[PDB]
Amino acid sequence: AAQTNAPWGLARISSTSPGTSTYYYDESAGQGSCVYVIDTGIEASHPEFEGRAQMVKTYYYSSRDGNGHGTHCAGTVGSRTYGVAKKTQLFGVKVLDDNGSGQYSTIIAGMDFVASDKNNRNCPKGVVASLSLGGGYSSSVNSAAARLQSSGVMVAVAAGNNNADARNYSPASEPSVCTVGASDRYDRRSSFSNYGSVLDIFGPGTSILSTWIGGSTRSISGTSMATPHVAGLAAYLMTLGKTTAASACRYIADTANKGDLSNIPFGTVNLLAYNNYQA
Numbered sequence: 001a002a003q004t005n006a007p008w009g010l011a012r013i014s015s016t017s018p019g020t021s022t023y024y025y026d027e028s029a030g031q032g033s034c035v036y037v038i039d040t041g042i043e044a045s046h047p048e049f050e051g052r053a054q055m056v057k058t059y060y061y062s063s064r065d066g067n068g069h070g071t072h073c074a075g076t077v078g079s080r081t082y083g084v085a086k087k088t089q090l091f092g093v094k095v096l097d098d099n100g101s102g103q104y105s106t107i108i109a110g111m112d113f114v115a116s117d118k119n120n121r122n123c124p125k126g127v128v129a130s131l132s133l134g135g136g137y138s139s140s141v142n143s144a145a146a147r148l149q150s151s152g153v154m155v156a157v158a159a160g161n162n163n164a165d166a167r168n169y170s171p172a173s174e175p176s177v178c179t180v181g182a183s184d185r186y187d188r189r190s191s192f193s194n195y196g197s198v199l200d201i202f203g204p205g206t207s208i209l210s211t212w213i214g215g216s217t218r219s220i221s222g223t224s225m226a227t228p229h230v231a232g233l234a235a236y237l238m239t240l241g242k243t244t245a246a247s248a249c250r251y252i253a254d255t256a257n258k259g260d261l262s263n264i265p266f267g268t269v270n271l272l273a274y275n276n277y278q279a
């Protein structure tokens, strides 16, 4: 399949070079996989989700996304126009309030929720979780992310937006999950992107067009935006049978575009997520 005039990040994920505008992908498009978006919620009624999105849990007085950031992330995972895996099922877990904040205890509860909840869903091709959030180092937060991964969920987490070593942030610093840095359309490390040995991969994170609340769309930037590209890619690859939740991060790194990013600090991987799709 070919989607012309796609957002730059989608085009980048299916290209060996920057500067193109068509997204190429296998028509299976993540069908039979599921992705949990653990965030401010998802506006499931957005036409872009085509009935494939649903809220499954909230820790607040509503499951509505009153912020937009969860909806944006979900759109990059699996919306018809803005998504990597255009046929995946999307499950929203609202651990962040409408200001985008959340107590670590709530975030941890949300991760343990997903580890159990997947047993209540039909995801024959596999399960992914996208965590576009983080804070200071916490062994408890890292342990929760590790449990989620261990349970058989491909966990992708944002590296963080501090232009600093991600070793000091959680869940970014958890070794067993897939920690995602951000790049821009000219293959530069995004100016705000964290880095360090704990990073596994980079994805598009600067000026990313996706869904927003009120049935709208929006371009925003962050490692929060890079993470769902990788989560969607994992779901897509699992549907193709190329990899599994336990090995998807390794597979993505193995098949990434290598050495193509600029301003990657010595000691950080120079790897950009790539679907290796040959039309």
Ligand SMILES: [Ca+2]
Pocket: 174, 175, 176, 177, 178, 179, 198, 199, 200, 249
């Ligand atoms: Ca890792």
